[PDB]
A paper describes a structure:
Structural analysis of Drosophila PGRP-LB and T7 Lysozyme, along with a multiple sequence alignment of PGRPs from different organisms, reveal the highly conserved residues of Drosophila PGRP-LBPA/PC histidine 42 (H42), histidine 152 (H152), tyrosine 78 (Y78) and cysteine 160 (C160) in coordination with Zn2+ in the catalytic site. In both structures, the Zn2+ is coordinated by H42, H152 and C160. In solution, one should expect that a water molecule would interact with both the residue Y78 and Zn2+ like in the T7 Lysozyme structure (Y46 and Zn2+). Additionally, the presence or absence of Zn2+ was assessed by X-ray emission fluorescence on PGRP-LBPA/PC wild type, Y78F and C160S crystals. We showed that Zn2+ is totally absent in PGRP-LBPA/PC_C160S mutant as already observed in the structure resolution, while it is still present in PGRP-LBPA/PC_Y78A mutant and PGRP-LBPA/PC wild type. Noticeably, no Zn2+ was added to the buffer during purification and crystallization steps, meaning that the Zn2+ present in the active site of PGRP-LBPA/PC_Y78A and PGRP-LBPA/PC proteins comes from the expression cell system. Of note, in the wild-type PGRP-LBPA/PC and PGRP-LBPD even without any Zn2+ in the media, the activity remains the same confirming the strong chelation of Zn2+ by the protein.
Numbering used by the authors: 12 to 181
Amino acid sequence: TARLLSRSDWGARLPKSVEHFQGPAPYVIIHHSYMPAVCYSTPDCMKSMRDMQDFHQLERGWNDIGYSFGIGGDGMIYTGRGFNVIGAHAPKYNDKSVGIVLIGDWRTELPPKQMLDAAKNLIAFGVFKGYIDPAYKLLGHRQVRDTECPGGRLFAEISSWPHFTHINDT
Ligand SMILES: [Zn+2]
């Protein structure tokens, strides 16, 4: 069911500037948006992507939306900065990671199946296409920075995914 929607598909503004990194991403880092909240229709999820891009570009002065990709409750994938582009989601990992945001607050609630499947499919495409290292490490934001992101319940879910990696003795 999951489609990869382009920047133009969701009416993205141009990035002010694009910095690349080379070679397949050794890290995949999972986030939740927190705000905006879950979006269930493509129209709402495209607006959610423009809201995050506008917050990051216009209020924070960033080059672009900080995430590599967004996932909606429509079960669609939204291109953010995309593969091999330096992110603004996970300081120290921005130049060697795919930053994937599941739109919504997943502290307590588990994302619906179509969002989890969409995230797993995006990762599989990336490995398939050589954008994600075949030995990639899957992390939650909270493993590399003091944060609740990507929410306790979503963190418990990705802990069950293949390539989920412990990077510290905790
Ligand atoms: Zn995060």
